[PDB]
């Protein structure tokens, strides 16, 4: 392929570098349209700038914790992180959430990959090894109230017991209820003055839930489970404009009152190089 | 049973892995993809559009105006603006070319930089743009500028003049993040002659500026971008 052909002097009626930009058409002008050049080469096709990349790396998307201790006397288990859960989504963590909000609707299969490590931050006489079990509670699914409910049978619920200090790589097909995922959804569940506006509505794939299958050793152990996700088999439609002002909550495009500028100021002059 | 030997790197969780992995939801069949206008394939298709550079930062806050490169009526030989080309910073740091190109570490190609006047139909002007490749500095006045790639432009019906910054570098790639070996250079714009104004009209007029990337643009090595942050996890 070629970089730019050779170009000699000129003089015409045909003025390439003079257009009317109020039409909306960003003119495909060129170097070799404005000067004397030479034939060169390309040897580049940006494999690294293809959307099945600049969207599809393994990045974290969310991090909670739990703990295995003696439940004997707990009113509510959750309140004890005896076991936990996740309203699956992506907005939790801004680094990836910025890449995705780069286009309007997106579509793909994913590589939800889990990993988890433990702490005995207090007079432990050995680091125990547990096994974490992570469930997937589809919206409409019964829910784990305790670290040893029946819910934790997972008869028809896709679960994976893996080990601490280790990881698990369970990949899932795209499960949009529609031809692709809505990123911004200027809508409401219904024509009712009093409902919530935002995509918060369009997006349940429900939750996730992790507990620790062992009966409390004697000392206390805390586990911090991390969830990593890699989009793959992507398509994206309608780019938009990238976020400038920071984030404030999942599924809202808000920004904080009283915020430091985003436009870097110009010390001195505009004339200033 | 078939004999194996495990190599160093077992169980390493490299995040950049294209590996084969099982379906948590087997036999499950998706929602039939339909059609949607506008569809991206490669970042590089969208950064070939233009956006406006706020070449006029000089504010207390962010401003619709930090975008308006003003023009001063009946002056001459004077400077209109300037800056350098660290498209991974300054003015540029907040455009679609920035914010994206920001996402990568290495770049190359030739920027196309546009410039549109909005002065009363019946006013004229003839100024000059000009790229000053790397070696000296901000031209600091016409003459010195003019001996660099530059382009006189006569204002008429065609509001926009499209100047193109020829990729002119030794090495064949440049650190997106600012660095001097891998420096880009500069560019200005001076009153060729001056800005005239029709009778019964008054003040200043303006130039809008945009910058888009070229056919030839190049970007590799994916880095993370600075431009965003969260001290903490967000909430429902």
């Amino acid at each position: 392929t070629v970089a730019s052909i050779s170009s000699g002097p000129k003089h015409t009626q045909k003025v390439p570098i003079l257009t009317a930009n109020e039409t909306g058409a960003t003119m495909p002008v060129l170097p070799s349209d404005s000067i004397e050049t030479r034939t060169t080469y390309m040897h580049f096709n940006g494999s690294e700038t293809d959307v099945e990349c600049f969207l599809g790396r393994a990045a974290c998307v969310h991090v909670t914790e739990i703990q295995n201790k003696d439940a004997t006397g707990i009113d509510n288990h959750r309140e004890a992180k005896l076991f936990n859960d996740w309203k699956i989504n992506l907005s939790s963590l801004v680094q990836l959430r910025k890449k995705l909000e780069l286009f309007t609707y997106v579509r793909f299969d994913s590589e939800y990959t889990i990993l988890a490590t433990a702490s005995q931050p207090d007079s432990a006489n050995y680091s125990s090894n547990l096994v974490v079990q992570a469930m997937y509670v589809p919206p409409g699914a019964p829910n784990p109230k305790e670290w040893d409910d029946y819910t934790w049978q997972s008869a028809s619920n896709p679960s994976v017991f893996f080990k601490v200090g280790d990881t698990s790589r369970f990949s899932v097909p795209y499960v949009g209820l529609a031809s692709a995922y809505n990123c911004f959804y200027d809508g409401y569940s219904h024509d009712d003055a009093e409902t919530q506006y935002g995509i918060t509505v369009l997006n349940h794939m429900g939750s996730m839930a992790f507990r620790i299958v062992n009966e409390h050793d004697e000392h206390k152990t805390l586990v911090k489970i991390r969830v990593y996700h890699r989009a793959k088999h992507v398509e994206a439609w309608i780019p938009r404009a990238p976020r400038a002002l920071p984030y404030t909550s999942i599924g809202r495009t808000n920004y904080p009152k009283n915020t430091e500028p985003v436009i870097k100021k110009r010390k001195g002059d505009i004339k200033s190089y | 049973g078939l004999p194996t030997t495990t190599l160093p790197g077992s169980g390493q969780f490299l995040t950049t892995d294209d590996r084969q992995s099982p379906s948590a939801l087997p036999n499950y069949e998706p929602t039939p993809r339909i059609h949607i206008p506008g569809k991206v394939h490669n970042l590089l298709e969208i950064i070939q559009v233009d956006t406006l550079i706020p070449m006029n930062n000089t504010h207390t806050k962010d401003e619709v105006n930090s975008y308006l490169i003003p023009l001063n009526a009946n002056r001459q030989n004077e400077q209109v603006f300037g800056t350098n080309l660290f498209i991974g910073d300054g003015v540029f740091k907040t455009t679609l070319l920035g914010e994206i190109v920001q996402y990568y570490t290495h770049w190359s190609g030739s920027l196309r930089f546009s410039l549109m006047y909005t002065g009363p139909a019946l006013s004229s002007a003839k100024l000059i743009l000009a790229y000053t490749p790397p070696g000296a500095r901000g031209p600091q006045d016409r003459r010195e500028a003019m001996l660099g790639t530059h382009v006189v432009w006569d204002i008429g019906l065609q509001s926009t003049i499209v100047m193109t910054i020829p990729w002119t570098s030794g090495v064949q790639f440049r650190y997106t993040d600012p660095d001097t070996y891998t420096s880009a250079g500069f560019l200005s714009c001076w009153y060729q002659t001056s800005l005239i104004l029709p009778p019964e009209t008054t003040g200043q007029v303006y130039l809008l500026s945009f910058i888009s990337a070229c056919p030839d643009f190049k970007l590799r090595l994916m880095k993370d971008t600075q431009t965003i942050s969260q001290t903490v996890a967000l909430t429902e």
Partner: antibody
Amino acid sequence: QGQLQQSGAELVRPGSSVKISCKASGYAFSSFWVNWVKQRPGQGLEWIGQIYPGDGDNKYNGKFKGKATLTADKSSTTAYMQLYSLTSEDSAVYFCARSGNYPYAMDYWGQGTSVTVSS
Amino acid sequence: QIVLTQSPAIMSAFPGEKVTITCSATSSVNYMHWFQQKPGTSPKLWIYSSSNLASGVPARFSGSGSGTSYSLTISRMEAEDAATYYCQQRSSYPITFGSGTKLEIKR
């Protein structure tokens, strides 16, 4: 034993949003939660949310989805939360309390902050 | 969402008169936490976990039950009884307090 010292009597013009506080004193903030209850005048011991400093783990009662936005600061060991779009329903009383020492519900309790919305 | 209900709404108790209150949640709450409030004070932990006399909560007191409906006792009311009572559910999640058997004094 600890303390849930609270913010001070609040007068907010309607439509605003204020932040009352709380601060733990002599127990490890970063371990137990802080619930908040909106016991209005001649009104019940209402439950806004509950937040956990420890990692930011939390939950809210569906009345206050929007209104209440619980929050903890790990150094000044000061819980908070602030109400948005104030209305004279928010004219009630907010209390914070330490939860889960476990034999007991929110055992340790704070005094409160008065929130009154009007011009 | 287990909807709580303090048994009487309020009465009055001549000191000596033994006092018994009750909570009747809809569903099953396993642990009844009883809070009390002599106004001008923060509500305070009387009986935790169905039947335990919290700290400093005197002996006349006590209570129990389960599943649904639990209760409270004060072998005979006093002065320091004419307060308000809150049973309190912690089992179901939008953690929800009682109603209010406003304890009443008789003279």
